[PDB]
UniProtKB/TrEMBL annotation, chains A, B:
Keywords: Acetylation, Hydrolase
Membership in a protein family: Belongs to the glutaminase family.
Domain STAS as annotated: residue spans: 327-441
GO biological process per UniProt: glutamate biosynthetic process; L-glutamine catabolic process
InterPro entries named among the record's database cross-references: Beta-lactam/transpept-like (IPR012338), Glutaminase (IPR015868), STAS_dom (IPR002645), STAS_dom_sf (IPR036513)
Pfam families cross-referenced by the UniProt entry: Glutaminase (PF04960)
SUPFAM superfamilies (UniProt xref): beta-lactamase/transpeptidase-like, SpoIIaa-like
Protein name (Swiss-Prot/TrEMBL): Glutaminase
Encoding gene (name): glsA
Its EC number(s): 3.5.1.2
Catalytic activity: L-glutamine + H2O = L-glutamate + NH4(+)
HAMAP family: Glutaminase (MF_00313)
GO molecular function ontology, one term from the record: glutaminase activity
Annotated organism of origin: Micrococcus luteus (Micrococcus lysodeikticus)
Length: 450, 450
């Protein structure tokens, strides 16, 4: 059988491809002349899968879509403090107002706008880095997430460098205020080359997947960026990626994304998917007309919306078996606060101490809640509590005859766990032993420690 | 053993409670006189748990935090089309500019600002609803999610009704532009009473949990609102809840939230938690000083950030066993696109047709990717692919001797599945049978159908 997702993409391409409104980027001859009859799309999954359709192997300059990647590198190369002092976090239109730098901050609004991107480039390696080191540091970060050595299309670079008065304007203003140190020409040159890096709809998908996983490369499993750094990048994509229309975009689509004037659109939905879309023509506000509509389709047909929750929940608890005197509690999935939290519910739901719990709510006041609670399997199916309820069960009819003396924690089925999970699950075990309960942790591939 | 989460909350209360900067809402005597020495916090989980600390049982007028609830009711009572024609989706400051209504839209920016909240109230039941029907329709929606009959503090209502010139101003302007039909006095009266509804830190937590689950009540499991309606509410909370500071807030905290001038703060992080915080004093921008700082603490200590993914992923696949000629594929958790997607990977990863797959990537170009792929168990642990890889395994060495003829899909361990999951998993099964493979669906509590 053939995977049905790519067939969905092919249908979407054909349906939305029935028309092609808008225009190709006019302010740069090379892009205005590009072939408009192109439309491709790709989805890179968290686990390493790649679905596509249409022109998804056609290279094009990434332009603005490169902004979240250089921001990432700047954060790793200089640290938050140095970068935040130069780049802000507020949404705004690309139209520039000097008043935004007059603030006691003296820094452009965010990293998605040109002025902010020029400050990011300037920060790329260190204060004593040359023009060349910063350029390939840019090319390097994009290349490392794309999984292959990328190149700069000098034809576009030269084409744009000849009509770069606006960005030179932005760079000179930024210097007067001290956000740039080197020359306006030098920083603008590096950013224009940066925007000229060539990628395909599939490179973007994979690059976006790196951000969606929190920094881990989906095709290898190695960490390319620290999760805290990726969180900030996807955060700014959502609040500023679509400028003044971000509010409308978050609600109707709900996907962190950034478009580029060459037709490309980058998407990255944490924990679920990396998206790459390509369609030359732009709408009245500068984005890829079909590129963004296609994102809206993916969101409406699949509910791939940042506000549509998809958590591990109680499913972190694979099962709870009360063999006899000992209890077997197995865990699974990627454990973070979500799973760790449920785990703590399981452990606590065993009577390993005088059970004088704090319901939290007055049963007398909420008769409905008590009734619903009376059937824990039903309520657990309606919310999504996995096998956590098997804990109250083990401590149920089974405790009527015999106390629990040993608890085995098996983590074989667990893929990974962050520090938050580790510290929480650790504490839960520390408190078990305190109840005079034996606790043995069966962890084949030592994952538990910090 | 005692659950460690509430102990964390108690520590946080004591730590952040060491100081108490800001002022109580001054523009309404009753609130300016309220006792500032109060600080409580509560967390309501998706599965029905409630952790708390400090003054979390003290009632206070919900004020602005009521806005996302009336918006929800308006959406259900009138439908998106009627409501969107009166209320926009763009962020903005509470400071009012007439220019926002002059747009061809002729509607206030969003539902979080007063002007937008007044339009929401006006729409509450129907065009022919009385002043009274709209007031209790408001009280009703908040009461239904809080799980108990709430009441209006008329003392605050009268106190505020005596100094409601600003909101009357907003209501009269909205009438001139046709966003309100009834009198300015009537709509303002209903909204001020609306803001006077009394709730505790724990009511908010639970009310917020209703939004975080996509509309399902955590203490009962019954649907209080349709998921599409909750998605829109949490979407606007994130983009407009914190006004012009939403960008900064999304990045540093990442929690959909709204504060109220009485000291309360509502939080709702899809799929993970409903939050309620109370702390009378407000900062220089009108929010609960400690209320918001406490949200920042929860986000930094637990990584309870909208951009920190927590997806079910491959864990939707509990396990894949190749008993012999038949294969057993069990599923678990709350299946949506995330799980359904992985399921489709499992099914496809079996050779039930001439295996001429589309790698998606050129192995020659990405030697690293091929190597990593060579060890599917390792790569599946590094990304978080659950037991989906057991599919390629069943179709592995095992297929060297004998083809697969029957596939059993067990959904007993699955809690629930949306339409997206149903349609996708359905299609995957339709395509299996097409390969001449027998497919038997073991679904005890008929969940599959649409
Ligand atoms: N390279 C362009 C930016 C294109 C874009 O917005 O994607 C300058 O200006
Ligand atoms: N009831 C207030 C709103 C308070 C708030 O912003 O929470 C009016 O104005």
């Amino acid at each position: 059988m053939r995977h049905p997702i790519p067939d969905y993409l092919a249908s979407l391409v054909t349906e939305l491809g029935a028309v092609n409104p808008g225009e190709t980027a006019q302010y740069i001859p090379v892009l205005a002349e590009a072939d408009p009859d192109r439309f491709g799309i790709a989805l890179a999954t968290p686990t390493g899968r790649l679905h596509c359709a249409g022109d998804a192997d056609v290279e094009f300059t990434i332009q603005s879509a490169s902004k979240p990647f250089t921001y990432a590198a700047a954060l790793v190369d200089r640290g938050f403090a140095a970068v935040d002092r130069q780049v802000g976090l507020n949404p705004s239109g690309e139209a520039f107002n000097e008043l935004s730098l007059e603030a006691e901050s003296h820094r452009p609004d965010n990293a998605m706008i040109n002025a902010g991107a020029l400050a990011v480039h300037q920060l790329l390696v260190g204060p004593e880095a040359s023009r060349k080191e910063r350029l390939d540091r840019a090319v390097e970060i994009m290349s490392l997430l794309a999984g292959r050595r990328l190149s700069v299309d000098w034809e576009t670079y030269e084409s744009e460098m000849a009509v770069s008065d606006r960005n030179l304007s932005l760079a000179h203003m930024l210097r007067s205020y001290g956000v740039l140190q080197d020359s306006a020409e030098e920083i603008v040159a590096g950013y224009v080359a940066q925007c000229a890096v060539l990628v395909t709809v599939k490179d973007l998908a994979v690059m976006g997947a790196c951000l969606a996983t929190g920094g881990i490369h989906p095709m290898t499993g190695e960490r390319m960026l620290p999760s805290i750094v990726a969180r900030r990048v996807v955060s700014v994509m959502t609040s500023s990626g679509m400028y003044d229309a971000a509010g409308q975009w978050l609600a109707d689509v709900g996907i962190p994304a950034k478009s580029g004037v060459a037709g490309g659109v980058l998407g990255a939905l944490p924990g679920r998917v990396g998206i790459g879309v390509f369609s030359p023509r732009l709408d009245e506000v500068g984005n890829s007309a079909r590129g963004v509509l296609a994102c809206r389709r993916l969101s409406e047909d699949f509910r791939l919306h940042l506000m549509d929750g998809d958590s591990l929940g109680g499913t972190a608890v694979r099962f709870v078996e009360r063999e006899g005197d000992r209890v077997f509690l197995h865990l699974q999935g990627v454990i973070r606060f979500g799973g760790a939290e449920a785990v703590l519910d399981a452990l606590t739901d065993l009577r390993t101490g005088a059970e004088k719990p704090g319901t939290g709510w007055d049963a007398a006041v909420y008769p409905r809640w008590q009734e619903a609670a009376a059937d824990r399997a039903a309520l657990s199916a309606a919310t999504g509590g996995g096998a956590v309820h098997e804990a109250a069960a083990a401590a149920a009819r089974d405790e009527n005859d015999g106390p629990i003396r040993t608890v085995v924690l098996n983590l074989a089925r667990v893929d990974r766990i962050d520090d938050v999970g580790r510290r929480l699950i650790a504490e839960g075990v520390r408190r078990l032993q305190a109840d005079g309960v034996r606790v043995e942790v069966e962890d084949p591939e030592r994952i538990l420690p910090l």
